[PDB]
Design a protein around this ligand. Structure first.
Ligand SMILES: O=C1O[C@H](CO)[C@@H](O)[C@H](O)[C@H]1O
Ligand SMILES: O=C1O[C@H](CO)[C@@H](O)[C@H](O)[C@H]1O
Ligand SMILES: [Mg+2]
Ligand SMILES: [Mg+2]
Lengths: 744, 749
């Protein structure tokens, strides 16, 4: 059926036309790399274009599809691609923030909505999800992932692929997804984007690979090859990755696209000239060439010289044609070119309300200490509070529209998003006064601020000095009843090519924060960030800290919802927050070492520890507070022993012991006590997000079976070994209840 | 003969019970030196029962002789003991810490320092040193960088050879030659977070191209023993890693010696999480580990394992034979008391000749990092602060100004710490009658007293008192404002580096940097004499201090050597062997890095969509091979004897180096090669040669390097050590950053 159709089409094709299906030039207003493609009208005519990307607007896409359908010899329709990462126009939180919902239904929903919007506007293909594991918060691209953990990363990868594609991409509101960046890109040395990656095969499989595999097994249509080398070979020329693992081991039936000029960049990597690396890429299992024109300009010559087989070419071409067929583009090239759809599907109130809900769900309450508010009274937390009197909103993130959506919002209308001040003004009209002061620049260094606010994120820095801005803010702060310090990163301090060697709140903002605290007014830190920051000073001195990541186009409203208690925060961290950059890499699923430092023993000579800080993150994986409290009973294991075909249930009663209704992410960890290789001190193996009224309890039950206990041993065999296991359940990866069982 | 050894050992082993064979594999700890937590007990009775193969941490020929006499006269078979110690950079005469010593780029001096240490150690009963430490590291957070020779495997390998040869000589036959022990096999310098003992993980390709060569070089130089490392490799503690300890070490490299564990390395595998004591002990001996340091895994569990078939008699016999062979090769069956001459210590230890050598080698190790011109007096053109004639009032200020015990450096376990002159003491002696040495402590080591305590353990107290920072600073400023020049003696205490001394920030500590700022504010000329066991983050100091001399830890004669440099008796010629980062967030920085697919071109920081950071450029403050002189050297263009060679060929790269300044001095001329295109990505350069030359003012020398295809080999994707045809770039210069370039082509034919 498909096979026969594609056989017949391919029998007609010239070598040039087969090669053309593998070519993906760039166009439009959206800029995601340096090199630009020329002469696109003619190339479509010559049959030399497989797809395009970065073109926005159903009408413009329709026009281009027409040229392909009507002006090329064979009429083969184009794929239309875009980075639809965490929204099209309705922007959800950045993926890292979104991961802190621990809510696969919400995550699927966000992808569903983005697909509806993008498909309504002509897009058939998104370069998403980004599933790279990272333990290095220096790397700006942590903003695009789902944190450090592969179990949670894998579940999220599945939710995103399903949200975008549905069952089989048959509907006109379903699009093809693309798991990226295969593979290991999050382990770039120094946290410096694009830098050398190196690790053992054992680490690859146990620690980094699961999310890519989960996407493949969820039926993801395409895979993007990464910029990094693996084992000294750029991923785009690594046949072990792109054929042996991807196809041979996991059974991937789709196609592989490069990242931006990934082929020609192999010249700079230092593995040969354009022809050589182009031939190596297609022979490795790469099917589509993003921008470099390596395939289109050199593959014929390589075929003539016997460096690439006609077989290899036909396979690459076939995979591209199968993707087009599966999307329904041969049945109808204009499947996604309904000019009536943008008006009914894009940036609707329904979509924006969903984004607002998901944003509030993504926030992580890091601290909410009791503060003396009125003398004589027992100390109470600052959050939540009723919007009354004068609310100061101060800082460089307080009145920026364009920094609200987050990095990788290329189709968003940035200056349509309400700033925090605008959203809070709306939400408190008639009830409180919102008093604004800028307070500081983003950072002292003007050049830094300029590059940190590129892609239209300017904060309109002017000639007012740090001291002037501070003084104005203190005048405002001292007229107020409470201070909302809106501080942290600009959105483009994270994302692609946005690596940091220092992870503090920037200098002038931290100074501003210190001065606001010195007023004696209550201070809430509303923290904008795309990554873990080093917050030990803020943890010591600020009473309340709400990590809002970048919450999307409706962030301002969601922040209001959290501050005023309309939503009780329930986010939990998915990446460790280190005390300093000298502890990197810090991650919860670490080996014990031969000289573990016992709890509370810092400092101890001859143990694995530092002279100047303990081994712990400030906030561990899975950490997050609520306006209520939860209490855990002891773990009930249904068996003390099981065999390889058996099973048990781990159960724990969770009680809401405070005064607020709220959600709790109950987290399941397992430690394999003894291994033929060293095993992590714990691994996340399940979770359940529960909602409880005050005083209400729920018995949370986890099924545990031997398949969950498997790991890649020294010989890379995926096996569960007999022995003892420790089951841990708790409110984060640090504070847990424990019980043990034996596998026979 | 080899056959005589086999016959003798065959005969001895025929006598031995299983318990006696197991006993040869047992290495308890005793004596006054502390290098770990666990301690041994009942050693006298254990030796009597034949349950002890060697001991370590026992100092003094009288004590060692007594113990050897018990082994020889009172055990059934009289098998003599090995006596081990960490003789790392000196016995009593202390040379610079190894990392400092590596900056001499002088293999003759390095060999000499090991020779002297062996002479002193052997005089005092020691037959075995746990040295050299040859671990590659790119992570200056790790305290043990102090013990190695930097980031580079080419230089690392040459130093490993020099050290082994210095200790052992041709074949350990002489009574002033001892058995060496290459450590820590393997990859221990890549521990995550720079945190000692932490997880190591890397590809096999990285192991062989970037980390393994120095171990291999020690093995090929005939090192008698290998110490297994604390870290895991491929998820297996090195002490249980049969691929490391058998397949690589014996299978690939032909190692003929024995493997000892590190301190309780076997029982620590329980904590690593790979099983109980019996299980991990069986795995260790089966892996190729021959001697058990302290844990008593072998002695307490091997017989049960042999009964149960978990370890074979053949495996026990092989391990025992290796130990007996080491003892045989050291001459201990010929004479158990070879090293127990009670009269040698008085004539061989801490002699003037030894100490004069140490003083010379210390001055040779220092790295001049900065020496800018300063205007001392209106109307006189500006000149550098260093060197200066000792006259007037010379202030020496800081917590490292008057500490004897912090001079030798970490890993000086046999030194008499309180006998080393302090810097003030040394400079006072050297300037008697010419200058007044003024002194103030100026600051504590660091603001936190608890930190200072752990930083000055092992008898390195700075005698911190309850004076306020104000008292300390005011006294220093009263000194500074009377002085003609200020020597700011700042940096680390010695035990801020070494084992279990990892740091997450690499600054000069808070109160010392505040002191430095205040001294600079006086307007008097300031020379930073920097004590450290590691690269530090020195961007502020490079911007603000006119002269910076890195003296590492120079050893027992450091004070005199520092005087030699300051007063111009020696012209500094040290070159860095490890990159100095601008901040900890750049780690790891190393010169021999891959290009990436998005390289930032020179001078283009910042550029979006290149491999670079938002907040700092990609560069270290000081690159690999960096070091200044009191003179300047200029380099002509490179002349290659031919532009094309094949696998059978060779060429010569030659460059004229001229001393263009006013001082005679040494230059380390460094050869780097870039393999431009590979089947795998190749580093942007690799050190492949060097020559240290001495030139008088105005003098020139043509420095020539032989380049052959064997130098161009590397491990490809399939771990084949191969040279590939293609273009190569030859670079020669004064450091890894500032170089001349020429190209040549390699063909198959
Ligand atoms: O450079 C890139 O370009 C791609 C196209 O914009 C994008 O999808 C990748 O995530 C990114 O690495
Ligand atoms: O712990 C150790 O003990 C050993 C014995 O002191 C020493 O040689 C090693 O270098 C060290 O790691
Ligand atoms: Mg187990
Ligand atoms: Mg080559």
């Amino acid at each position: 059926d498909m096979d026969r159709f594609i056989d017949a089409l391919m029998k007609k094709m010239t070598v040039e036309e087969k090669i053309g299906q593998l070519n993906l030039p760039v166009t439009g207003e959206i800029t995601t790399g340096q090199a630009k493609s020329s002469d696109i009208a003619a190339k479509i005519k010559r049959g030399e274009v497989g797809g395009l990307f970065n073109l926005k607007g159903v009408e413009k896409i329709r026009d281009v599809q027409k040229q392909a359908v009507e002006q090329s010899r064979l009429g083969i329709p184009l794929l239309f691609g875009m980075d639809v990462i965490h929204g099209y126009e309705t922007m959800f939180p950045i993926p890292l923030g979104l991961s802190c919902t621990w809510d696969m239904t919400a995550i699927e929903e966000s992808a569903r909505i983005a697909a509806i919007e993008a498909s309504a506007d002509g897009i058939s293909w998104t370069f998403s999800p980004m599933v790279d594991i990272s333990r290095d918060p220096r790397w700006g691209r942590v903003s695009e992932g789902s944190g450090e953990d592969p179990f949670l990363g894998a579940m999220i990868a599945e939710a995103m692929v399903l949200g975008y594609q549905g069952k089989d991409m048959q509907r006109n509101d379903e699009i093809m997804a693309c798991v990226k960046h295969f593979a290991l890109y999050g382990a770039g040395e120094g946290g410096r984007d694009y830098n050398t990656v190196d690790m053992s095969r054992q680490r690859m499989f146990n620690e980094y690979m699961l999310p890519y595999e989960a996407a493949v097994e969820a039926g993801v249509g395409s895979v993007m090859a990464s910029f990094n080398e693996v084992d000294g070979v750029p991923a785009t020329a690594n046949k072990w990755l792109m054929t042996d693992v991807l196809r041979g081991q996991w059974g991937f039936n789709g196609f592989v696209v490069t990242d931006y000029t990934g082929i020609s960049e192999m010249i700079d990597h230092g593995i040969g000239d354009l022809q050589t690396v182009s031939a190596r890429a297609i022979n490795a299992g790469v099917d589509m060439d993003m921008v470099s024109e390596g395939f289109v300009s050199t593959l014929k010559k390589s075929i003539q010289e016997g460096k690439v087989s006609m077989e290899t070419l036909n396979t690459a071409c076939r995979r591209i044609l199968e993707a087009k067929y599966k999307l329904g583009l041969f049945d109808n090239p204009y499947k996604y070119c309904d000019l009536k759809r943008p008006a009914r599907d894009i940036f609707t109130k329904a979509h924006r309300d969903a984004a607002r809900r998901i944003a509030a769900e993504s926030f992580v309450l890091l601290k909410n200490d009791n503060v003396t508010l009125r003398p004589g009274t027992p100390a109470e937390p600052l959050l939540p509070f009723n919007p009354k009197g004068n609310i100061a909103v101060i800082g460089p993130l307080a009145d920026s529209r364009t920094n609200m959506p987050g990095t990788w919002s290329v189709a968003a209308v940035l200056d349509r998003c309400p700033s925090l001040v605008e959203g809070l003004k709306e939400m408190t009209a008639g009830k409180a006064n919102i008093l604004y002061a800028k307070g500081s620049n983003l950072i002292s260094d003007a050049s830094y601020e300029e590059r940190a606010t590129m892609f239209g994120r300017s904060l309109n820095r002017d000639n007012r000095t740090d001291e002037q801005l501070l003084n104005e803010a203190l005048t405002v702060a001292n007229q107020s009843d409470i201070i909302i310090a809106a501080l942290g990163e600009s959105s483009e301090m994270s994302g692609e090519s946005s690596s940091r060697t220092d992870l503090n709140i920037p200098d002038v903002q931290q100074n501003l924060l210190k001065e606001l605290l010195k007023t004696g007014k209550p201070v809430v830190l509303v923290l904008f960030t795309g990554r873990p920051l080093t917050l030990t000073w803020e943890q010591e001195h600020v009473p309340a800290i709400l990590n809002v990541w970048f919450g999307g186009s409706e962030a301002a409203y969601a922040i209001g919802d959290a501050l005023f208690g309309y939503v009780n925060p329930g986010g939990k961290l998915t990446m460790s927050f280190p005390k300093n950059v000298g502890q990197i890499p810090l991650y919860y699923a670490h080996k014990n070492t031969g000289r573990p430092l016992a709890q509370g023993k810092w400092f101890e000579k001859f143990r694995s520890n530092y002279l100047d800080v303990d081994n712990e993150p400030l906030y561990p994986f899975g950490y997050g507070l609520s306006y209520t409290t939860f209490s855990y009973g002891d773990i009930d294991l249904s068996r003390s022993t099981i065999d390889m075909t058996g099973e048990l249930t781990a159960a724990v009663m969770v009680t809401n012991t405070g005064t607020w209704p709220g959600s709790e992410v109950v987290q399941l960890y397992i430690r394999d006590l003894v291994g033929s290789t060293t095993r992590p001190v714990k691994e996340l193996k399940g979770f359940q997000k529960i909602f409880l009224e005050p005083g209400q309890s729920e018995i949370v039950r986890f099924k545990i079976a031997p398949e969950m206990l498997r790991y890649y041993n020294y010989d890379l065999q995926l096996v569960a070994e007999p022995g003892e296991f420790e089951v841990m359940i708790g409110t984060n990866s640090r504070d847990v209840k424990s019980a043990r069982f034996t596998l026979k």
